[PDB]
Design a protein around this nucleic acid. Structure first.
Length: 187
RNA sequence: CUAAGAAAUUCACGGCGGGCUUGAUGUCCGCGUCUACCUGAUUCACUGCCGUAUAGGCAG
């Protein structure tokens, strides 16, 4: 956790950086699924909260063995033309800590209507009256649009950075690099 | 401080009966429309699960 690897987005004359970010995030998700482990933290060094911008720089946080296992994986092939890869340097000691969390939303009422059909055996009009169409959740959070190998539907994954703390305790990490209770340093 | 200031047009009404517009007609010769383009920007806010929950989380 003491080390970090920094990825900068090369500007692209054919693609805006958002879909490049989505592609690389899917590649690192596949790399972490293949590699395993629960000590991989993500960071957005230039996250703009004014317009919910993802940013043009990426920071991944891991240990030395985890970082060399990640860079040894051949997922990096086919993406070197658009990114920078620095060195697994030690993170600065006086750094505030913040958490990253995947915030999902119930933006589609018909999914929950189908769910309550499978839970309470209600009819179509019962679910229509019980759940209006205005219950959609709109999030002013940065997001990435990806499709999964298990389910081919394209899903949107919101990423939100927590408040700055002064210390961090041990926690877990998901397959996306998002923390289920962990923290990443800010610098 | 205005060619300032003021004001009831209104009651009633049968327009109609009749009619052959028809004869004839050459539109027409000629014609280089070209050249050059990322539709796509996160544009699939989607599928399922824990929960009575629309309250609120979780899975790829």
């Amino acid at each position: 956790m003491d080390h970090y690897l920094d990825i900068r987005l090369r500007p692209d004359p054919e693609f805006p950086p958002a879909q490049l970010m989505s592609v690389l995030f899917g590649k690192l998700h596949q790399a972490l699924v293949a590699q395993g482990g629960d000590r991989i933290g993500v960071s957005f060094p230039d996250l703009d909260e004014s317009r919910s911008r993802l940013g043009e720089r990426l920071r991944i946080h891991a240990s030395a063995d985890d970082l060399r296992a990640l860079l040894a994986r051949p997922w990096l092939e086919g993406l070197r033309d658009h990114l920078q890869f620095g060195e697994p340097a030690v993170v600065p000691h006086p750094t505030p800590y913040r958490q990253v969390s995947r915030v999902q939303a119930k933006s589609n009422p018909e999914r929950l209507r189908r769910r309550l059909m499978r839970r309470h055996d209600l009819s179509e009009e019962e679910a229509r009256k019980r759940i209006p169409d205005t219950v959609a959740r709109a999030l002013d959070l940065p997001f990435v649009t990806l499709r999964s190998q298990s389910t081919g539907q394209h899903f949107r994954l919101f990423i939100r950075h927590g408040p700055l703390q002064v210390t961090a305790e041990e926690g877990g990490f998901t397959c996306y690099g998002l923390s289920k209770g962990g923290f990443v340093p800010w610098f």
